[PDB]
Design a protein around this ligand. Structure first.
Ligand SMILES: *[C@@H]1O[C@H](CO)[C@@H](O[C@@H]2O[C@H](CO)[C@@H](O[C@@H]3O[C@H](CO)[C@@H](O)[C@H](O)[C@@H]3O)[C@H](O)[C@H]2NC(C)=O)[C@H](O)[C@H]1NC(C)=O
Ligand SMILES: *[C@@H]1O[C@H](CO)[C@@H](O[C@@H]2O[C@H](CO)[C@@H](O[C@H]3O[C@H](CO)[C@@H](O)[C@H](O)[C@@H]3O)[C@H](O)[C@H]2NC(C)=O)[C@H](O)[C@H]1NC(C)=O
Ligand SMILES: CC(C)Nc1cc(=O)n(-c2ccccc2)nc1-c1nc[nH]n1
Ligand SMILES: CC(C)Nc1cc(=O)n(-c2ccccc2)nc1-c1nc[nH]n1
Ligand SMILES: CC(=O)N[C@@H]1[C@@H](O)[C@H](O)[C@@H](CO)O[C@H]1O
Ligand SMILES: *[C@@H]1O[C@H](CO)[C@@H](O)[C@H](O)[C@H]1NC(C)=O
Ligand SMILES: *[C@@H]1O[C@H](CO)[C@@H](O)[C@H](O)[C@H]1NC(C)=O
Ligand SMILES: *[C@@H]1O[C@H](CO)[C@@H](O)[C@H](O)[C@H]1NC(C)=O
Ligand SMILES: *[C@@H]1O[C@H](CO)[C@@H](O)[C@H](O)[C@H]1NC(C)=O
Ligand SMILES: *[C@@H]1O[C@H](CO)[C@@H](O)[C@H](O)[C@H]1NC(C)=O
Ligand SMILES: *[C@H]1O[C@H](CO)[C@@H](O)[C@H](O)[C@H]1NC(C)=O
Ligand SMILES: OC[C@H]1O[C@H](O)[C@@H](O)[C@@H](O)[C@@H]1O
Ligand SMILES: [Ca+2]
Ligand SMILES: [Ca+2]
Ligand SMILES: [Ca+2]
Ligand SMILES: [Ca+2]
Ligand SMILES: [Cu+2]
Ligand SMILES: [Cu+2]
Lengths: 709, 706
């Protein structure tokens, strides 16, 4: 009816077109982001502006004309007497002709300039101040401890956390580490940690305001030499070569027989075309925000839409430690960007070999579109489980089952050391499983002092620092329509007398159903009682009279939220909740904000604002889910944290939404009575895989979508 | 060794030969037996003692004697009992040996014995030939009564009465639906049969239930119907749509994704031993307790002596007596006994290895359940691990998780339970169970909605909980283990370099749990985030070699303690508990608890009794479950999705570095290489494609119980 693809990310043309539009009317002194100074004017990002929902649905459902495709741009305006970041909407694509400043509309005033993310340039300007005007003042020490030459670069920095202690601060603790080659630098901290202040717009004005060496705090790298020279510093010598997991990543073992391989014996059974995937049961668009990360829209099971949007909103990591970097590190990874940092998927490792892979395009900190090759994979997996089965020996004498095969969509953000895997998986039953693994390397500190309270030793000199991971997701169900209710069902035992034997007691198992009517009644804090059955449902009912529902079951071992006493906790208020449900809104598009990380004491978005007692009885509702877990690192996280058991997320499960299990109708289901031949091709499809069905494809030659330079 | 191998058909035969000659006449085949008879109910492996078995495995000592355990029904005598008799040694038994009093302290009350097949047979005779006809009038207008009730069928329930000693079972009535689930077609009528007498001929019917009303006999019921005081509605006895069928109407399409092993299978199976590059173990089936694995070693080093299923438990709500008073303890029937063939391609991957299983239960000859186990290797389409670096140095390394898997399925009335043990190459072990098959339904007579959902025409989907119990005999770096609990906390502190500013200081929190009840964790109370069994042997970085338990469970609130029945499955009240392993505490429950949980033959909470768990041979007990409120999507079956429950056993400083780092299947390259070159990267190589195909074996099926 409405056949447009209005959820798709911008093409290169589209991106270019918007850049050209902007170039022209920003004007006096627009610099390329990739070399911008603080005092420059800069285009930080250009990406899709999502359509408003009312119009989108009108188009898709009621055949109306589609809304204007627009793009949003972030502009650092540094070349003024009162710098600002600005958000600018630009359309209508593909040939734009207007531009609108929506900053004060969305934020209520101008964006203070320090909120802006640190630029690639800014990182380089810092690393010069470090390696040219600072480390030099301590070649004595460094020649001694850390194999340092002239200046040379054998070391390497890495950033942290918020940057400072107050709204307004821009001061980052940087750890120093050996530039290892072909493997992870994060394990090889050298015990040096500089607190670089960089608020000023003139990099010359940038001071170092504290030093930390191997357990001790000094006021500068001068003092540090003074003492080292004065023999007054006991210095630990940390190697820069080694062998095994803390050094390498290459398995020293030769390839053995081949892992199992999965193929689609007579062609695939889904198809991807643009941002749009379609299979016999399922239909959806998939995307990728620069900063939010992955998203799917307009999901439909057999024609019927369940969810308008499911989308990553934020990712969080909270550290402890001995040493000022980690003890103060609260990463709000959106402020770097889960899209911006998405990475190629290595065919046969990150997804099955025959997955279909799909490029992503972007214009970030640049002036022309680039592309991450193979950023998404989509594939149909045979789970090795049945979805359902029943064997009957009792009375008759039949078998009926179906092997679960499933449809997956994956992307991976790789930020610093972390490799986040994001999955969404679509089940034949009509259920949707969201999963989030964390792999890759481990951020580490130099092992020194009271360890046990702050992690485990994992390699020599190497503390695996304790941290919590948490992720937030937006789940905008539209259960059989916009207007939804949320219900809480649970159990209870009521002690009673056996009706037919009143001497005796029995414990009466009962169901309990309560209707949650206000936003607060459906806001569940971490470590609180949570209804065993929580679902959103329609006013409409199914064929047996029960409300049509989708149940949210969580899979989270959430750590313990940063205490609310912390003046920075407003910057990730969503961590306090397991689950919340809120009235959907155009002014509440996101949980978080790329600007939250560099000023969480004065948040651009405070998710707790969304919970503001309003009815959730029969409105357009959106459910916000938090998933996460505490990580105390240990030896088996070397070289990499492994995915097994680190999976975390939620199901969306149909609860009296249908009138019966859709999989009853699967083409793949199997059935035979005891009185039949089950090794008969006409009774049973599986009887005729061997002769003569399907002959295993020739494989694409391997290839890889490479690295950023 | 073939030390934990269930009994061969030849061995099983030879014990029955012995028991036969040595119990003399009369002694009847249990498939014939009446209560007053003598009877071999079951003959299965007696698992050896740990000490003597480790002796033989770790120190070339000779093997502990191989013994059977026969359960015998001694009805032909003034004082009737059940006896547990050990017989041995195998393969040619010379001795036999009553151990009943040794284990239990008395004899076994005969009313604890499982209902035989004959018993059920007889109970049906009585109902169908001498009871239902008294209401043939009502049953004609209710539900198509005929000849003589060939259109109807019964199903047992839970414990069988209201106190110790009773043997009175509520049975529902259902249409004998052809080639699909009767469980969805409760005809509205429930009978409380009393079958305690040793004379089947003395069997009363204590009570009757119809449409929300209880009578004292079928005759009193048919009376009130004839008197027009009972509104009957005619219940349809056929239909369409998987209320009535399992066969799909939609014809089969292009095939789903097939896995294969390009250069052959990478594991082997000899007898009951599975061997692979990384994992080596033995597997089997307890007739009552079900699936189990032993002597699990990772790269030669033992992690677990034994992991096994102890019990399975379903507890109901309801409008009707049969449901509202139903707590099954499915071990009472037997997960091993009721294990079913695995349908190749559906229950496991087409190219799994499927193993037969032998048993001698309620008969005098051994028989086989074909394709009862499947073992296979499975590509997860997930990386075990991976890092792609664009920062400072350009490389990629990672590895796709393939996983090794053992499975059997128990089918108990309406349920199909799936028992999965999955072996990861991180060195982790994952235990999973899945509830599928049919639900049980009650006939729907309004005032429901505290007890379930209408789920079909005339059917109530009855609320219940599921639970299962696992014994986990971790020998972390030898027998002597301790248990640690670690977790997290936030501590307000001034910021060193800026004391005016505060800061929430995140810290780990560790604690040794010396005494059994420090490590007993009840449902509803909170659990430490990290919890593992340690050796005192430390790893290279100076940390106690550990194996963490991590639980995946949504457990439903357990039957309250106040219930006189509860001691029959006291494990339900715990998520986790750790205990001194003891030869006199082999099992968490017993086959005899079902039929008398008020006088429980084994009560689990006895095992927790203020001993020390600092430095002894520990065994961990894990309870996993969920609340199940049925709904339409459970028609025809309940699906697996989201219903997995179990636990992970995870290395925690057990090794010095992740073992996967030595993987034969690992992939690595730097950007300065040609990732498409076969010898930079084994993925850029082509093994035998097309050319042509995986070669697939001819399909076949185990069959049915005949
Ligand atoms: C954040 O920074 C931007 C850019 O500096 C501010 O927007 C700019 O505002 C000036 C007037 O304040 C606009 O001037 C307009 O066009 C010409 C100059 O080109 C001028 O002579 C006219 O009087 C007219 O006002 C300028 O075009 C505009 N630039 C953009 C790109 O929108 C903005 O006001 C700052 N944000 C806040 C909240 O203060
Ligand atoms: C449960 O019932 C068991 C079988 O009825 C019973 O085992 C049998 O015990 C009797 C004596 O209690 C033994 O009979 C023996 O009696 C004469 C004495 O005049 C002996 O010289 C002979 O050895 C003769 O066989 C049976 O041998 C014995 N049978 C077996 C298979 O053990 C148990 O004792 C009863 N258990 C309890 C706890 O009461
Ligand atoms: C090539 C140059 C601009 N270096 C960097 C690139 C870069 O993407 N990051 C970065 C910053 C935050 C998260 C992930 C990566 N940091 C750095 C960085 N970090 C410390 N110094 N430089
Ligand atoms: C043909 C005869 C042997 N019938 C039965 C066999 C049987 O295995 N069961 C059974 C009882 C409980 C759990 C699983 C199966 N029940 C019955 C049974 N249940 C009610 N009537 N008969
Ligand atoms: C902020 C506040 O006062 N809370 C109000 C409450 O007083 C009021 O009665 C209710 C009516 O819906 O809405 C909420
Ligand atoms: C670190 O080493 C890599 C290759 O191993 C080299 O190409 C790169 O330029 C080095 N980077 C530094 C020292 O920042
Ligand atoms: C139910 O239907 C089957 C179909 O053959 C029949 O053989 C079986 O005996 C019937 N069961 C009963 C209890 O009548
Ligand atoms: C660990 O403690 C046990 C218990 O007595 C002892 O036998 C063993 O040798 C110990 N080993 C070490 C290294 O402490
Ligand atoms: C459980 O325990 C008490 C014991 O007094 C019993 O009377 C009742 O059924 C229950 N009540 C409470 C409050 O625990
Ligand atoms: C049980 O607890 C008591 C404390 O009264 C303690 O003294 C004793 O050692 C424990 N006894 C057992 C059963 O080991
Ligand atoms: C229930 O709610 C609204 C009014 O509050 C109504 O418009 C809607 O159509 C209703 N659905 C029903 C009665 O099924
Ligand atoms: O079967 C029982 C039988 O064997 C026993 O060993 C003997 O003691 C006999 O007295 C007896 O008749
Ligand atoms: Ca709100
Ligand atoms: Ca909604
Ligand atoms: Ca043990
Ligand atoms: Ca004990
Ligand atoms: Cu982590
Ligand atoms: Cu269930």
């Amino acid at each position: 009816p409405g056949q447009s693809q209005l959820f798709a990310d911008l093409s290169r043309e589209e991106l270019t077109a918007v850049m050209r539009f902007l170039t022209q009317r920003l004007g006096p002194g627009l610099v390329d982001a990739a070399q911008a100074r603080p005092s420059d004017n800069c285009v930080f990002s250009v990406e899709l502006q999502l359509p408003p929902k009312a119009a989108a649905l009108a188009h898709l459902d009621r055949g109306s004309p589609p809304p204007a495709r627009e793009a949003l741009a972030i502009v650092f305006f540094g070349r003024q007497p009162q710098p600002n970041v600005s958000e600018l909407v630009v359309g209508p694509l593909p040939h734009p002709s207007y531009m609108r400043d929506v900053t004060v509309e969305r934020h209520g005033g101008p964006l203070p300039y320090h909120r802006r993310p640190v630029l690639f340039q800014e990182y380089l300007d810092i690393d010069q101040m470090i390696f040219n005007r600072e480390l030099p003042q301590a070649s004595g020490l460094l020649h001694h401890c850390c194999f340092y030459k002239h200046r040379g670069r054998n070391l390497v920095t890495m950033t942290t956390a918020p940057r400072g202690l107050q709204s307004g601060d821009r001061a980052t603790w940087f750890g120093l580490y050996y530039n290892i080659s072909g493997a992870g630098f994060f394990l090889h901290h050298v015990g040096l940690e500089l607190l670089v202040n960089h608020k000023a717009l003139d990099p010359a004005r940038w001071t170092i305001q504290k030093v930390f060496y191997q357990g001790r705090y000094y006021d500068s790298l001068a003092q540090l030499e003074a003492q080292f020279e004065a023999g007054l510093v006991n210095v630990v010598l940390i190697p820069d070569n080694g062998t095994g997991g803390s050094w390498s990543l290459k398995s020293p073992v030769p390839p053995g027989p081949a892992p199992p391989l999965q193929f689609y014996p007579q062609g695939p059974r889904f198809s991807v075309q643009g941002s749009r995937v379609a299979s016999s049961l399922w239909t959806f668009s998939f995307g990728l925000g620069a900063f939010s990360g992955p998203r799917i829209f307009d999901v439909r099971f057999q024609g019927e839409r369940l969810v308008y949007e499911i989308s990553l909103q934020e990712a969080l990591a909270i550290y402890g430690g001995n040493s000022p970097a980690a003890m103060t590190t609260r990463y709000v990874d959106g402020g770097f960007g889960m899209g911006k940092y998405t990475t190629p998927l290595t065919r046969g490792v990150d997804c099955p070999y025959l997955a279909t892979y799909v490029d992503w395009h972007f214009l970030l900190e640049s002036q022309a579109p680039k592309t991450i090759r193979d950023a998404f994979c989509v594939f149909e997996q045979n789970q090795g489980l049945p979805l359902r089965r029943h064997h009957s020996d009792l009375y008759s004498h039949y078998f009926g089952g179906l092997a679960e095969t499933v449809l997956v969509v994956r992307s991976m953000s790789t930020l610093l050391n972390y490799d986040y895997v994001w999955d969404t998986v679509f089940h034949p039953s009509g259920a949707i499983e969201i999963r989030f693994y964390a792999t890759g390397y481990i951020s580490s500190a130099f092992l020194f002092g009271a360890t046990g309270k702050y992690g485990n030793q994992v390699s020599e000199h190497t503390l695996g620092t304790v941290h919590t991971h948490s992720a937030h997701f937006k789940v905008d169900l539209d259960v059989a329509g916009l207007e939804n209710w949320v219900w809480a069902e649970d159990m209870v035992f009521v002690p009673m007398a056996v009706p037919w034997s009143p001497e005796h007691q029995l414990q009466r198992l009962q169901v309990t159903r309560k209707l949650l009517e206000m936003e607060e009644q459906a806001a569940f804090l971490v470590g609180s009682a949570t209804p065993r059955y929580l679902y959103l449902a329609s006013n409409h009912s199914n064929k047996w009279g029960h409300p049509r529902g989708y149940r949210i079951q969580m899979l989270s071992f959430a750590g313990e939220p940063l205490p609310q006493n912390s003046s920075m906790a407003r910057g990730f208020s969503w961590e306090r909740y397991q689950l919340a449900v809120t009235q959907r809104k155009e002014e509440e598009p996101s949980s978080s904000s790329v600007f939250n990380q560099n000023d969480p004491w004065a948040p651009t978005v405070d998710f707790s604002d969304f919970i503001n007692n309003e009815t959730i009885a029969g409105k357009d509702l959106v459910a916000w889910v938090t998933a996460g877990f505490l990580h105390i690192p240990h030896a088996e996280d070397i070289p990499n944290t492994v995915t097994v058991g680190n999976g975390v997320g939620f199901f969306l499960r149909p609860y009296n939404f249908f009138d019966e299990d859709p999989s009853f109708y699967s083409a793949d289901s199997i059935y035979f009575r005891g009185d039949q031949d089950a090794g008969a091709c006409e009774v049973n499809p599986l009887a005729c895989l061997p002769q003569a069905a399907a002959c295993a494809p020739d494989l694409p030659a391997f290839s890889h979508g490479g690295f950023s330079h």
